[PDB]
Design a protein around this ligand. Structure first.
Ligand SMILES: Nc1ncnc2c1ncn2[C@@H]1O[C@H](COP(=O)(O)OP(=O)(O)O)[C@@H](O)[C@H]1O
Ligand SMILES: Nc1ncnc2c1ncn2[C@@H]1O[C@H](COP(=O)(O)OP(=O)(O)O)[C@@H](O)[C@H]1O
Ligand SMILES: [Mg+2]
Ligand SMILES: [Mg+2]
Lengths: 56, 371, 371, 56
């Protein structure tokens, strides 16, 4: 019974830790999505300036 | 009250209240029934998604444009498009608003008569008026003379106007437009391995054409350069990955405008039908038309067309005349801006086709004095 | 009244009233006649023990599953199983309850027609409806799109669905499933000395597979590690003592899913038939299917499969798309939970095959509009 | 004994999941760092262009 309690406690902590890690990776994935949007927008704006200047 | 300046077009329906700068709602004119079976129950699946909704579910639809070349080939779908435009994109009942449709030159009469009959019977507008798509584009430029080349997506037409007096014998309507360029681009992409067949993938090819293609200043030099270096190959990411690289297909797709022999059409390019349209005019207004050549319509937005066309016309025209090509940055909505200006005029307020007049003479009223 | 959501399956029959969270009675679908002679008189020995009763007397029986690969090969035994399920595990007479069976995709017609004929003639239900086992598993996830890989015990099938519209041309049904993995495990255990032959000992090998086997993240590294260290050897106690030690048989048994060449099957693994099923779909719904890959069925419960499959698909798929694998903890009963949800819907209440309709068109009614 | 075995298996599963999640989050952080490096490089090039345009 004592060993079962110990193992259950460690497994519960492991579940909590993996939940925290999954939330953290979600946050960082969202941040990378935002920065990818930033690069898309800046490249699009540079292309717009290029086409405006080449087309006067 | 305010007037509704609708503009059916062919490819993008542009609408909005009279007196503004830009159309309120712009959305593709496609009606796509679902084609697969459908197993989820209660999902709320409709029988036809129109407008911009069918550009997001296009993976399981069969989009079909209701307007082929200016003319309308499928009246039920066009009625559906109009109903959507009035009720969901503007949310104004048509019972309390005049409408100002637009129509290409030299179109079949039955199309115009059916259009007015629908507007008066189904939607029950107070008064509607049909205007030629080129006069509006001339309004928007703030001119009163000039020869306007309105290369839309359905049909390219070239209406010369002087001092407000249109010249009906010099209108040169050519049926090459953006849609044929999309089909030709989709046909030459197969030379590298990319095959687009489904009616949904035509939209992807259209996006490629819009974002990458450009008109070459000199065709042979570009063909020679693209065949030696690799400074032209621009890549593009499909809606699922697998980037593609477009080589000399970039300036070969829109070159069809100046050499319609590419898609097998006999006629001369848009660079020579303008000169022919000018030469049919009288000998004393050719200088003004040379100096005030106006571009409009969506397809004239290719980067570098306002220089190629000027070079071509300068080659054709006499050496003394000055050739100037007006290419406003708001080219795409030029027709609608002109429509708003025309509908906002006080002098024009008595030209509408009032409903009692239609009740007395039938749909054939449109060909009469109220043009 | 309430509906009976039965789910024949192949290996475990799961049943229960519509509107709950879990099936009421889950028991193996085996019917085993005794094989020895029997000398005690008056012991009350029956002629066939079905369901969970024959998993306790399996020492003197010859268990034989009545469903081989989705299809039903022994109709009398299947009728016996259904009779047991209705009368002893649920204790509700079928004369007062609609039934909702489930069937694998691409199964023979005669199987489905015989199923409906039995349900209407022998058990005499009021109305029954047959549904594809993958749409239900998609219901249970609360999605409306996604490609579901339902690796049961009889047959593994992979049905892609978008916006509620199933794609009938992209269903990839493969006949490798849990039973073949049990046989392969029983065949590779002989490399250490343990021989299981009797049809009763197949159950012991199944228990070994359930409790010990796991899917390796990388196969070659695991094969190298298990051949040097001894950190993998897990022991297990047979039903009579004589513990056994499983070495690298642990991850070699379920590896057959990703390399069906182990059991001599030609086809590609479950990691590549999903990608092929996606690539048959249209080019515009591939991103959504990539992002909503759903796992279901019992055999997808191996510890570490939701990572191996994601790694494999990410290797195959384009680098830009995001690959996500939905693996709910209630995987085993996902099909039945979805069945309960579907039977509890009000919109679905008029899709049942009413008995008068069957009387008018015969058993071939199932292929008709009432699918 | 059954409960102890269940707990041990849960613990092993959670530990392996946490290992995979940690490796994945580190890799995604590396990718974000690389894209930020590209953005900074082109931004410095544009800043040099602006410095020259100050003379324009
Ligand atoms: N930025 C662009 N570059 C190149 N082609 C364009 C661009 N925008 C639109 N087009 C082409 O023009 C068409 C839209 O033309 P439009 O003026 O809307 O036609 P309509 O006269 O029917 O309104 C599209 O089909 C597209 O092929
Ligand atoms: N926890 C588990 N771990 C590994 N395999 C399992 C587990 N539970 C069930 N299985 C396998 O799945 C099969 C049961 O699959 P199931 O989903 O009941 O099939 P069906 O679709 O016929 O209901 C069993 O034969 C067993 O081999
Ligand atoms: Mg137009
Ligand atoms: Mg199943």
């Amino acid at each position: 019974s004592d060993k079962l309690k110990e193992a259950e406690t460690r497994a519960e902590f492991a579940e909590r830790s993996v939940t925290k890690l999954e939330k953290s990776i979600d946050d960082l994935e969202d941040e990378l999505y935002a920065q990818k949007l930033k690069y898309k927008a800046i490249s699009e704006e540079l292309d717009h300036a290029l086409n405006d200047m080449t087309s006067i | 009250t305010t007037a509704l300046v609708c503009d059916n077009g062919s490819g993008l329906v542009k609408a909005g209240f009279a007196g503004d700068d830009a159309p309120r709602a712009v959305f593709p004119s496609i009606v796509g029934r679902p084609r697969h079976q459908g197993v989820m129950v209660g999902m709320g699946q409709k029988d036809s998604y129109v407008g911009d909704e069918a550009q997001s579910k296009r993976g399981i639809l069969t989009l079909k444009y209701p307007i082929e070349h200016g003319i309308i080939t499928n009246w039920d779908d066009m009625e559906k498009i109009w109903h959507h435009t009035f009720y969901n994109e503007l949310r104004v009942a048509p019972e309390e608003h005049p409408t100002l449709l637009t129509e290409a030159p030299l179109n079949p009469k039955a199309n115009r008569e059916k259009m007015t009959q629908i507007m008066f019977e189904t939607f029950n507008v107070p008064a509607m008026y049909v205007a030629i798509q080129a006069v509006l584009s001339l309004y928007a430029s703030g001119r009163t003379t000039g020869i306007v080349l309105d290369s839309g997506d359905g049909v390219t037409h070239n209406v010369p106007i002087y001092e407000g007096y249109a010249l009906p014998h010099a209108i040169m309507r050519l049926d090459l437009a953006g849609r044929d360029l999309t089909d030709y681009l989709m046909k030459i992409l197969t030379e590298r391995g990319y095959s687009f067949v489904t009616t949904a993938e035509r939209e992807i090819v259209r996006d490629i054409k819009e974002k990458l293609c450009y008109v070459a200043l000199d065709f042979e030099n570009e063909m020679a350069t693209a065949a030696s270096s690799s400074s032209l190959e621009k890549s593009y990411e499909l809606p699922d990955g697998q980037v593609i690289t477009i080589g000399n297909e970039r300036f070969r797709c829109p070159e069809t405008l100046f050499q319609p022999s590419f898609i097998g059409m006999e006629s001369a390019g848009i660079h020579e039908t303008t000169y022919n349209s000018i030469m049919k005019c009288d000998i004393d207004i050719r200088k003004d038309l040379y100096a005030n050549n106006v571009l409009s319509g969506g397809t004239t937005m290719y980067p570098g067309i306002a220089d190629r066309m000027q070079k071509e016309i300068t080659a054709l025209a006499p050496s003394t005349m000055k050739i100037k090509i007006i290419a406003p940055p708001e080219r795409k909505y030029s027709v609608w801006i002109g429509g708003s200006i025309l509908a906002s005029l006080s002098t024009f307020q008595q030209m509408w086709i009032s409903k009692q007049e239609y009740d007395e003479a039938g749909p054939s009223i449109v060909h009469r004095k109220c043009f």
